[PDB]
Amino acid sequence: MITDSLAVVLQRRDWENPGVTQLNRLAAHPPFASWRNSEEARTDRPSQQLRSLNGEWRFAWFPAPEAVPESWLECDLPEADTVVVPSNWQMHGYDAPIYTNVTYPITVNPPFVPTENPTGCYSLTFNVDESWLQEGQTRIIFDGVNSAFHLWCNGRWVGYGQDSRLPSEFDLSAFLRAGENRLAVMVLRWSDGSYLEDQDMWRMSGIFRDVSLLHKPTTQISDFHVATRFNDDFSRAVLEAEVQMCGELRDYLRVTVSLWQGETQVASGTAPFGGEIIDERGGYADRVTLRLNVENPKLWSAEIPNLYRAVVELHTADGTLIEAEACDVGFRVVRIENGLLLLNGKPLLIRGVNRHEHHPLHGQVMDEQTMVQDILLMKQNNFNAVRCSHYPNHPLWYTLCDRYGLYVVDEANIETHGMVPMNRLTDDPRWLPAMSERVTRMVQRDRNHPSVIIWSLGNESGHGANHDALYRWIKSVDPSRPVQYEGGGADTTATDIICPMYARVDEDQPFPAVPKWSIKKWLSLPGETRPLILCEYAHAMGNSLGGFAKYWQAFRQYPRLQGGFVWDWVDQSLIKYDENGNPWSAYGGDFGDTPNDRQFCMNGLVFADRTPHPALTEAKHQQQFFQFRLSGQTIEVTSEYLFRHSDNELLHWMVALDGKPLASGEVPLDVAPQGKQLIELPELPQPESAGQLWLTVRVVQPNATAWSEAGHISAWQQWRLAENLSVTLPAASHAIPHLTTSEMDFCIELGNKRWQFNRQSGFLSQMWIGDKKQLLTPLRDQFTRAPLDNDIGVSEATRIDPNAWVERWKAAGHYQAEAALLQCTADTLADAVLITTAHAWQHQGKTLFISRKTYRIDGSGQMAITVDVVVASDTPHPARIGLNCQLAQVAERVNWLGLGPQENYPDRLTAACFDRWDLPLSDMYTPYVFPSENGLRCGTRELNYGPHQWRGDFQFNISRYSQQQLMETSHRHLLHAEEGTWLNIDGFHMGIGGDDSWSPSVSAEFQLSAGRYHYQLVWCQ
Amino acid sequence: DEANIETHGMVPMNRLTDDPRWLPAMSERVTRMVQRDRNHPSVIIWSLGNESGHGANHDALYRWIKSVDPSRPVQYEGGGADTTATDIICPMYARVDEDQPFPAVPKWSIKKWLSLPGETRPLILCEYAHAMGNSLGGFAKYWQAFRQYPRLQGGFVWDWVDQSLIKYDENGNPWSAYGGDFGDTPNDRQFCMNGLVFADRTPH
Amino acid sequence: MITDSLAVVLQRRDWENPGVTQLNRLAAHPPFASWRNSEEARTDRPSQQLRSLNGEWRFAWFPAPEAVPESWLECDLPEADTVVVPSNWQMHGYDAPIYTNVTYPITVNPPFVPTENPTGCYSLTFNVDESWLQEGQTRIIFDGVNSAFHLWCNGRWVGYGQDSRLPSEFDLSAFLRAGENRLAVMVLRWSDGSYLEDQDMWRMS
Ligand SMILES: OC[C@H]1O[C@@H](SCCc2ccccc2)[C@H](O)[C@@H](O)[C@H]1O
Ligand SMILES: OC[C@H]1O[C@@H](SCCc2ccccc2)[C@H](O)[C@@H](O)[C@H]1O
Ligand SMILES: [Mg+2]
Ligand SMILES: [Mg+2]
Ligand SMILES: [Mg+2]
Ligand SMILES: [Mg+2]
Ligand code: NA
Ligand code: NA
Ligand code: NA
Ligand code: NA
């Protein structure tokens, strides 16, 4: 067999030819199991005709396709290892995974790939029983192979495939023999299809989804479509089922479509083959259309995922079953009328998130347990929609979104971000066959899923004529779903929905030829009528989602702003091992990949092991389905559910005075969809004790659901009630602190306590309790923070981005400005000691900051610090204005009265509640993989740590890591706990931003721009 | 200018053109025509082909042409001459006053067709007045209607020249042959000769 | 050259695969003449860089692609006649032209064509001056070939084409040698493209 050899098969070079995307590959279709029993098809029991080939395969790695020896087609190589399939081979140490965002990981010369094309040679030896070979068709299904592959069965060449994210099927019935069979798969890392697969993710390769064998009869169901059509009030539905057969037509062949609600049968129909006349030549003799009438169907939504079970039986006229197929059916209609995306007649508000298929140990191989873990965490955090970014997912994902209830945007595997210009391939008709396959085979696979409500043409591919053609193709074959597409400025003719990426709420971004308007402006542009759903917004890179409440204020206010998809769900960090076998989270660059985009792979709301970032609580609160308004004693509760009554909800309210509770109660919620309920509170307590009174309400789900435990909190809100200002005089103690002045220091002693102020630096250098020194570093002003990912942007040491906040802070010298003592005085009062200092921060003769402090140690041992800071108006605005010190104490728990429990920032504090919080010190540090400023708690009135107590109204963070160490360390596993405890206490702190992470995104009301700042602290014990 | 797509023989007529596995083959035939001929001023209308039913591949290729070349209308007859893949209602052999109510692809009369509810496009007959032999009776009825109605903008007579071939009998005398005269079987006999002129371009 | 042989090129059977409509064919474009003088381009005088290959070619008819001998790729067959190109071979008495309106002239089984697929083997021997080979690109333009064809230049496989009514262009600059060149074109009567070419006319090739 010369034509089966590697020298002949590889000479054509099908992976460098966009005109050849497949050879001998079967047609795309919904997932089949080929049940030969209709009751087994109804109850979804596993079919004996669908056989999984997952498990241990033989694997050999090669640097090029030409390096594979000819003997591999007949027998296993001696150097072949045994790997588990599905896997990526970069996760088993054969070459390195590459992380790159925009730049292609190969030389851009389409359609050519490098000759150094890493090649994975898979082989499997397996037995086929002889009953499969006597009759029928046996196909092999590769659910996903990255990137391209040739297939051999028993040394004979079967076919070729591309499009890594959709299933490739090949007929093997002329290739298999009885008994022992060998199956050789040669997987290439790069192909012509890699130019269409430039998604921002780790570039891996291999057989990364399931491999299976399917045995079908000779006359078989080749395709089936379900479509639901409704009347005006959704009380009568028509399930239109279109079944296609292949094989030889017989007049005794029948098709029965039965519809089941659990165990009871709702509708049924039967028909012989032969469609209606559609043109001059007749109709389809090999197709049927069955129309089933359903009276009062239970409608599918993400709130209530009502599913039916449709069973399609191919059988003869006397009644013997040939084949059964089945799919879950949800009755739902998605349409855009009058500029609004409607589901079942109601306007959606998309609480969405982008989700890559990522596992930190297995790369891009997804199992069911991680998918179920993601869906539960999404619904417990008030998400109702997922965008498949940016490729079709594993087929089980759509089934689980049908079952639990999530809207799905299904997206074609087309991204050519790296091209210059971005539409170089998508405006070329020579690439229209390759692009069409990626769209048409997605729609043919996934059109029956009720959770898929929107088709997407891909991501970031410019706007070419191939998008307009593929837009119109989908609208022809599937009118039941809108089509969206972002590229070319988000409002082209190839989209039903304006879908911008990272457009801001109020700020325009006038880029040439693709401007990102503000989303409020974008709706009102002349001639613009479509709804706006952000396909990516609120870039969650590290310590981010500042200003997330501004989006959700705008989403609720404007009807045609129907929400969006947060970028993104999970960090794409991988696991490496250092030297002791200790795992650590790796990002781009850590595998020797070059060039790479470093930490832009980690943008998740959860870590790669699915533990939450603190920004997930902010997303949960802003996306909550109950809105609250307080007016006196009355709470109105507005439901934002569209379809369900609040039948698993009770409102729990509490009133507390500076953290200690005074009154509480529980009210059951009975609120209609989009309705209101007035909750009259009782006569709330009116304590004459000083302090702010706080009302907190919570919506608790008493019963467990499919996706939540009992007692799940789904919504909350807090308000300030009446305040009593403290007019009580301090207790006049009779002791007096004693001031001692040397030429080195001022020394103030009172009882066992002692304070020392260095007269050359001007700072409080040491404090004593008895004979224990309390400080390791003096109490100094701090105007900087360890920069966030939003502060850094796309700036690195080679390419400075001069607009980024960290580059403006470095160029202004904020990180290296030195304090210069201007004056220092110490005075004894009638009841206190008064220390007054003044410092200037200068960089190259330019005074950046001036801080004037006042230390007042009274007879009670309290030290009242008042700080007045002047900031030069021409320097960039400082990241913080506050104090830091390194305490000598390492206590185990941190106690504070303020906003919490989780870390919060001035533009990310709406989810935090004011209460008395008590956490261990390890919970006060957020372990971001790229270390930065973290752990801040805002709105704090009291902080307790060890013997110390601080009072005022301040922001703090408290950790074992200095801001200097967090700035200079690239990974969190390289952080070492310092001696003692670093405390930062800020009067004022800049917002964190997070509209995007590559331009300055901190809005002007969260910048420290006032020029003069004042704050007060009381240090005591 | 008309793309080289006709699948008249298929049952049903859109069996290939509603199949996305044939969309790469159909797109090449359309996109390479437009890339060759878009600079000619005499080309005023693109045509997606002839007699291929109406599938989703026509709608995609319609929208492709409107994107790359907005300067020319696109017409397409298949699927009943008034589908979403045509800018112009272009029926084949629709009569002036008589309806032909075929199931799912009716040929209305051209006066009725313009006035159907929601219909706004112009009507240009892509084939009319079939000139097979001694024919073109009632040709004046079309041209009375073309001049009377503004949205009836004429049409294309089928067709210009007879497709007869030359054979030689026994003395070397040439004679005009039609379908069947070469041993071809099955064939459609004299339906190849529909011209207004003979094959040597002398007039009927 | 095993991969240039007829046993390897024809084993793929590109004419029964609607996913393969061309191999190594250049992009479509408006008609070019490549004038090296702008006044000659303005007055539409004939370009010396556009060379017609019309004229007398060698032709051999075969009932099937499998019946073509391997020696045809290197030298002319002894039974080869001399035909004028452009022509249809049914007008020269090699098989019959078929007239059919609606019914396909083959069995309707897409994308498969009959194994009795009449095959016309064209060949041309021609001289290229060395100035074309020193610099630049030399392409061959087939303005129309009914129905599908494989192309060889000097025994090396160049490419494949379908769509009988539009031009097929192939880069030959890595295939031509100085002096005498041979160009072998194997034209098939039926292909997968014939299912898209069911116009009411004489079916020729
Ligand atoms: O999937 C869409 C993507 O868009 C790009 S914008 C390009 C800005 C950029 C370029 C190069 C390196 C880093 C950022 C974002 O960086 C990604 O995080 C993701 O949102
Ligand atoms: O190019 C479009 C063609 O349409 C067909 S209709 C089909 C009627 C028919 C069928 C079979 C044999 C004869 C006539 C005409 O016969 C042709 O002359 C030409 O107008
Ligand atoms: Mg290819
Ligand atoms: Mg991208
Ligand atoms: Mg082909
Ligand atoms: Mg016809
Ligand atoms: Na809204
Ligand atoms: Na990213
Ligand atoms: Na008129
Ligand atoms: Na005719």
UniProtKB/Swiss-Prot annotation, chain C:
Outcome of mutating residue 200 to E/N, per the record? Causes a significant decrease in binding affinity in the absence of monovalent cations or in the presence of potassium ions, but only a moderate decrease in the presence of sodium ions
Keyword terms, alphabetized? Glycosidase, Hydrolase, Magnesium, Manganese, Metal-binding, Sodium
| Residues annotated as binding substrate | 101, 200
Residues holding Na(+): 200
Gene Ontology terms: cellular component: beta-galactosidase complex
Keyword Lyase listed? The answer is no
Among the record's GO biological process terms, what is one?
Answer: lactose catabolic process
Instruction: Mention one GO molecular function.
Output: identical protein binding
Inducers of expression: By allolactose.
How it assembles, according to the record, is: Homotetramer.
Family stated for the protein in its record: Belongs to the glycosyl hydrolase 2 family.
The protein's name? Beta-galactosidase
